[PDB]
Amino acid sequence: MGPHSLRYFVTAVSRPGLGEPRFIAVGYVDDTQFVRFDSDADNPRFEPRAPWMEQEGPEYWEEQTQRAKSDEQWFRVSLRTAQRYYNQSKGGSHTFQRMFGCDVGSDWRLLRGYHQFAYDGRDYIALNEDLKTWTAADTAALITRRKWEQAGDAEYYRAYLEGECVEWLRRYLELGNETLLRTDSPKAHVTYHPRSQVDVTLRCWALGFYPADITLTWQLNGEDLTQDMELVETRPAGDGTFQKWAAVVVPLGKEQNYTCHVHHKGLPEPLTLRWKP
């Protein structure tokens, strides 16, 4: 059920003295990468990055490669144009990024359509949530905004985001359903780590879970310790699942009073765990 998303993350980087920019495009469905294009491959093609994408036929791969190549040329031109326009007279490597795609609700409505750009890591121009107007960050982006209004780009991307974007998301969810529609519950446990005469560290682990969204919280007999804890970012295990941990420093000899609570799509109710010496 639930929300789903189709997102493409596109990066172009200029490379003084090396010729053409590095151009990389990557597609995700929810938290799972499924395609890529990379200009540095010796035969650059749009290609599958999940075994279930091998079900798409040659026409899909050809069409998508042609679109990737056309975009690659457009980023190259834009990088050259920006460098003129911002008066980057010392030259150097610069970055254009594009994010686009669709978030859909559990009822398949389009929650948000994205078509959005950054230059050297900063917002440049973005299609607003109305899919009609643009947010520009500075005067260069005002200039591109005028051109894009003139060309009707917002209307073109709105038609794609409300139509093809959603239709292809559905299709990919069907093709990859064994993997994309699964939910892998976290396997959790607590470890214990000496620190000093007066205290120790309890670390709560959540391993092997999908999707990535998760909450880990320590408590002391009901009392929420969220703010006293050390919490790492959720991280990929490399096999399609994710990991996370949260630790708390507690007085030597009171370990038993602390409980870790785990919330995840796969857990009908929160898991409660303690140090098990």
């Binding site: 144009t81 686009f100 051109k147 974007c165």
Partner: peptide, 10 residues
């Protein structure tokens, strides 16, 4: 389905 910005702007 990737879609191209194919001869637009700045």
């Amino acid at each position: 389905l990737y879609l191209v910005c194919g001869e637009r702007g700045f």
